[PDB]
Amino acid sequence: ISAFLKNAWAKEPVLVVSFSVWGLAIIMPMISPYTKYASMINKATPYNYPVPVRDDGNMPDVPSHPQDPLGPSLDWLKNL
Amino acid sequence: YPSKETAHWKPPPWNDVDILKEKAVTNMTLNFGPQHPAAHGVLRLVLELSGEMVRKCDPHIGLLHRGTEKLIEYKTYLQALPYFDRLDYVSMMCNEQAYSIAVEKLLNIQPPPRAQWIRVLFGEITRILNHIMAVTTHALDIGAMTPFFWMFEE
Amino acid sequence: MNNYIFVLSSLFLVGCLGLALKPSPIYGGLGLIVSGFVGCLMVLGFGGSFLGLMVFLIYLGGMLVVFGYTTAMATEEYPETWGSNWLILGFLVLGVIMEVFLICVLNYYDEVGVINLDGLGDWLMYEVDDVGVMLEGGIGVAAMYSCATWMMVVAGWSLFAGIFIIIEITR
Amino acid sequence: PFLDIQKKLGISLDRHFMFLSAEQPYKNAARCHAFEKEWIECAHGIGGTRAKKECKIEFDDFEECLLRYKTMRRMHDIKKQREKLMKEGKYTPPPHHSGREEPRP
Amino acid sequence: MNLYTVIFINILLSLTLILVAFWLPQMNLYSEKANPYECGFDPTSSARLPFSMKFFLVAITFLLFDLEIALLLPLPWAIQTIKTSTMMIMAFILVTILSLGLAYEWTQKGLEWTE
Amino acid sequence: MWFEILPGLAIMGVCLVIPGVSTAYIHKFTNGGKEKRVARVQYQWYLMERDRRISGVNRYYVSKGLEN
Amino acid sequence: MPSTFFNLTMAFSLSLLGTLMFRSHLMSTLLCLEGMVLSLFIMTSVTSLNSNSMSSMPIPITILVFAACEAAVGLALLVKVSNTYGTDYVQNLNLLQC
Amino acid sequence: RMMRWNQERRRLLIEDLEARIALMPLFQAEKDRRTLQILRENLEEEAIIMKDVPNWKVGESVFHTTRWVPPLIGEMYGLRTKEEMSNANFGFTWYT
Amino acid sequence: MFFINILTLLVPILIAMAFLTLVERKILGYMQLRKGPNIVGPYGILQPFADAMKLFMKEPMRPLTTSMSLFIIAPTLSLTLALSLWVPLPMPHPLINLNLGILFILATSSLSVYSILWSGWASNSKYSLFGALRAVAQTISYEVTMAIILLSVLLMNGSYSLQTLITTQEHMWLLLPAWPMAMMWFISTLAETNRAPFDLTEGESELVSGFNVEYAAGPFALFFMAEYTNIILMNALTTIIFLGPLYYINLPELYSTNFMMEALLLSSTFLWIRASYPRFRYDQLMHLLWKNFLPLTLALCMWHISLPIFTAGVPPYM
Amino acid sequence: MNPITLAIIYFTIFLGPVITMSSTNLMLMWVGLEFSLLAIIPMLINKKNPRSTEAATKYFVTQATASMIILLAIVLNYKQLGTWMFQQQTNGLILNMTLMALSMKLGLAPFHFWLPEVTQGIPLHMGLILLTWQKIAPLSILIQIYPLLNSTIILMLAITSIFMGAWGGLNQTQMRKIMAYSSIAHMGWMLAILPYNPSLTLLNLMIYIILTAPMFMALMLNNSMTINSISLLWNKTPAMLTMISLMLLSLGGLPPLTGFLPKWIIITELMKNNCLIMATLMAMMALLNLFFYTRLIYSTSLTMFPTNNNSKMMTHQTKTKPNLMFSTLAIMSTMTLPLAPQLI
Amino acid sequence: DMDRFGVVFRASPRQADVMIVAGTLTNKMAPALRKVYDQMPEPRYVVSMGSCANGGGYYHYSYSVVRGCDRIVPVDIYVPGCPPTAEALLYGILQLQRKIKREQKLKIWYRR
Ligand SMILES: C/C=C(\C)[C@H](O)[C@H](C)/C=C(C)/C=C\C/C(C)=C/Cc1[nH]c(OC)c(OC)c(=O)c1C
Ligand code: SF4
Predict the structure, then answer these.
(1) Which CATH architecture fits G2-98?
(2) How many A from CA of B37 to the centre of ligand 1?
(3) Is K9 in the pocket of ligand 1 (CB under 6 A)?
(4) How far apart are CA E87 and CA E89, in angstroms?
(5) What is the DSSP code (8-state) at residue K70?
(6) CB contacts, 8 Å: F54 with chain D
(7) Which residue, B83, F14, J130, K9, shows the most beta carbons closer than 10 Å to its own?
(8) Which ligand is located closest to the Cα atom of residue B35?
(9) Cβ-defined contact of A46 to H14 (cutoff 8 Å)
(10) Contacts for J295-298: CB closer than 8 Å, 24+ residues apart
(11) Domain extent listing, chain I
């Protein structure tokens, strides 16, 4: 079959490139570590207002202000 | 139940295949005429088309028919020579070479060495002429036009 | 420019009417093209760009094939324009006149509720979001790839199987 | 439906974009979201014949939000009376409706 | 209205140009110059007759591929969604399905013309 | 010779350069020392309608600042 | 909006009247079907843009998809009809009564 | 290179959107009081217009419910001129 | 002032068409070992005006077999679309800022086909109809690849707006990421516009001037300048998309100048290609542009869908 | 047809209705109906003769219009209520247009003119599927909206279907049209009761399928398509006359056979709602539906017709065609009345 | 080079201003010539090129030859030769240019 592919790289190299690129497109997302930051970046974009929340008195991990320590630090997007 | 209207009704076939007047093959016809630039000079070329592919070609030549043979019958052997220059008009010296050879055979006479050598020389020059012509006109027809202008200088 | 949308709708009606009178498929395809253009324009008037552009593109690519076919199959010596038939011309004129009379009639028996010649252009857009972003048509269609992925598979199967259907009908 | 295969398996192939108050792609409300939500929350547990007359007020409010016919009638009446008065010479339109106001911001 | 204006301007340019082309020159009309060309000789029949098209299957599948374009074209907006896996799989499936259909047509000689 | 083509190319280039610089300068002239605003989303249109209604003259491109 | 919805429905009705009331050719009938499709598309799109129901906006693309597949198979049947009889007319298709 | 550049573009976008988020409240407040001003103006005109017709409540509703139903571009901008009506529609749709 | 802007966008494009005709003739000449026009002006810079004037003084042909309505309306449409295509072109600041510019271009061109395709039918004759059907085949061939190529290319730009490509190309060209898509786009712009080797509708040696054999005067001139305007448009599109010039917000005329340079290069490349190669066959064009370009196009679309994700390079929505 | 194509096409045929059932959106419902439409035409047009082309064109052109009308109804409902489901408080015009188009899809009178033609233009299979499986999703639409239909045209259409099916099958020598008019009549019986306990509509549907499928197999076993061809069955395969007789006498509903149960219980639930004289008319034209079945079974089972000399070759050779389901479906028809309370 | 002068060919006679009869005109090819001349849109000119077309030429006395295109199309300018040197045809084309240069049409229209 190596000989078959050797023949097909000479005769009909357009379909060889096509199948190679198809398989590469399907396989490379599985490989990279950067694949997961895509959804995270699409999530980080604030297209709509972050609606504030009522202080029940039981919201420690929720911040009281924008520039407090709590909340998702977006510094992973910096210096990615 | 036989009505007046269902009287002419005929029972269907057993294999559900009716016999028909198979429609006439009305191919389209086109004059690939003389003015057409691919018609190499004058060429009617009626051709039938089933779309854009050819089912029949009937070349109606007769548009550079003058009557050169009858005029030759009316002229001398020397007066008749330029007709051969004018028959194939891109390979001139070869046609008159043929005529000359024929008349020489009828006369039982041969030309000398130098004349034969310059005759074959100009025959091959005519070959290069007509091959330039044929190749470059074929290319013009197919779409490539630059060989024409490159070789017509030669 | 308040009667804009009503003019566009009336033109679309006339295009589809001249279609329904059925001249040769050449002028029928011309009518389809003009009517798809008008449709695109009103879909834009109501705040939609993508859907109109795609109606236009699809119907153009389709009427191309209709031309290629009707030159082969639905062709006659005399393709029967709208003017070719005095009867078709009469029904076309009568249809324009009848729809005009009908609009002027239903603008009387009901002051408003079906058609508003008086207030026209005042009821088109219905609560726009005056402050907004990521709001156009195209997000909703791109939902075919997320949150409505059954439309995508069912459409793709229609096309895929249609290829096989084409080959079998033609063989 | 006829064969509730979705409810059998808990999936939602099509039964999650059935109406307006249903998961717009980014959280943009469709108009009459509140009205349709209220109509639907009235007509739950009930089926049909009883909801059509115990949840009629909410459907009528929804129908007026979506089709919005009575407001057309109201504005058409106001406009007609205004045109009559202006033709008679009784009404005098103000600057903030002739095109000359002090814009607010 | 800017775009409407540009298009009206181009329209009126074209129409004024045709008006000039028709009403500026001189005319000498007669039946032997107003009849169809066909290369010096006369036509043997009408041009409003069947022209057999030999790529009709290719035309229809072009229509279906046009719809495939219409389905693929929302991708620039589909990519700014949070999932970015469902859209990936679904676009993969769509393109692969289209390629499979193209391959079936190719092998069954649908892209070849009806000789 | 081949340098006898440069005249036509030069007219062609001077003609293709004008549609850009002309549009830029017309924009700056009408809107005023400013690029013509792009409003691709309704938020930008809101900002411009606002700035129109702030001006005192129905023009979105006066840019009232901290003098208020 | 109510005006244009009325007009679009009347346009649908005209195209339906067309594809019902036949003439000689069949291609014209297929075009009337395409016109009905187009009017339905525009109705759906306008309702979706008015109501701001971006969840239903995948519906008209589906309409176009299936309508174009419909047109495709109709045109293939037309190819067969022409290969049989030669001239596209719907009056030659009168042999199943017997 | 494209990867890194689009990476930065997705950060400039974050900045712009964050500014939009910071200024949403002011625009919302002003939008609210502007709409309410326009509705009160419509009401104060409808009063003098339809003072005479027999049965007409001037601030009446078209809904059985009592909650806030936000108005629409025709109730608002209804009694106003045609330019405002034709810029509410066709204002963004026809780009600046 | 918008009308003055229309002038500054429309009249120079027409002079550019007129002198592109000259440049075509002279470049083909010098490639053909001859000098083109150098008589009527100093170096032949008046031959286009001469041709136009002479064409508008010739008597137009209204045949008997023709359908005069479509006959007169098709060149109108042709030029109108060729001249409306220049509208959203950012050079760098456009005349009309649309958010879906590429869809406007695509639809406008797919409608521009109908000029050929109705002029050929209306002109009741054989070679005319041959040219029309060849146009149908050509469009069937190229439209799919054009759209999916353009999709794959803008799948790293993030929008259909033409103006966003300038910021997409602030530090690089899209030719190095996508040279294959650029190749296929170039040859599809060559199949579009009916330009050699993909001419196949006025194929003077196959057909005797298809879809123009019955057109003589200013109508034929309109078709001519429509073609020679679409050429410059497509070169402008290639150089806005792939060969992104330098914006420099303070120096926008620099963008305009580099745009001019690249557009002239690519147009001269079209003329070069006319001079060099022979013509394809309109079935060989199908075989090429379905059995070589569409497989690789779909494969590279898959690639360009994967690529924003596995590289974390998803572009922004404005 | 190669196997990949058959897989694709039969999957599509199976998935049209299946999408139609397991879908709350009316639009995916429409999608399923269109899959049923698209995928049927290849196998209708498989033998490639003018009759098949005509049948396929008639089917396509009649079903496309009905599809567009259903889509109109759906879009008008979406405009009215902002949903993709026919609620109550919809417009009766929308609902009636939906009913009209669905009747055109099924084949009910006065929309019946295409079904016998199309059925004659296609083989015995593709008549079976067309008359049994294509009827199931269009019926599912009505079953899902039964308390919204007007109880007047629903009955006028049923009565017209009854009358016209009976009268049309009275004089059809072709069997492929007898089956069509039988379909028309039975869809009439179904649609009459559909606003009244639609479980009985599905009962009549299942009974009708179980009767028609083996009948089509019987016609298939010798490719019988005419009274004179089915009459040459006392020589070719004479072990089938018993089942053919009992199946025809179940189709034309006679008591001891289970094909009388649907008519009987339909009349019951119609007299429970004071729909008396309509049921009387229906029950009295079912007799004419029975008459031509009786004529047929005379011709084939009781008064053996002349045969040919060449039919002895068929006796020399052997057969394999009865699929072992003909027996089960013919015996579960014609002998399952005493189990009727478990059917209802 | 002719394109140096603005003289480029066009295949269709309707996109043409002149026809050059470069060859022998036969009785079988004369209707086609006249159809083509007719289809050419006025203003239009003719150049008879060669002895075979000026007159009958070397085939003057033959049965299938018209003894000049003068009898079928109106000729503006005659170019002699068998063949005429392209130098000479070019001279004749520039002479036709000079002929067009002195047409005086609008002058006489004003003087009508
Ligand atoms: C850019 C310029 C162009 C495309 C021009 O069209 C070209 C350069 C000019 C041409 C072709 C000149 C003359 C036309 C013609 C039709 C001649 C007749 C002819 N033609 C032949 O072959 C082609 C012959 O072959 C042996 C002949 O004997 C005869 C008698
Ligand atoms: S070269 Fe001489 S023989 Fe030939 S066509 Fe010319 S005049 Fe006649």
Answers:
(1) Orthogonal Bundle (1.10)
(2) 6
(3) yes
(4) 6
(5) G
(6) 103, 105
(7) J130
(8) 1
(9) yes
(10) J296/J175, J296/J178, J296/J227, J296/J230, J296/J248, J297/J244, J297/J245, J297/J248, J297/J249
(11) 2-318
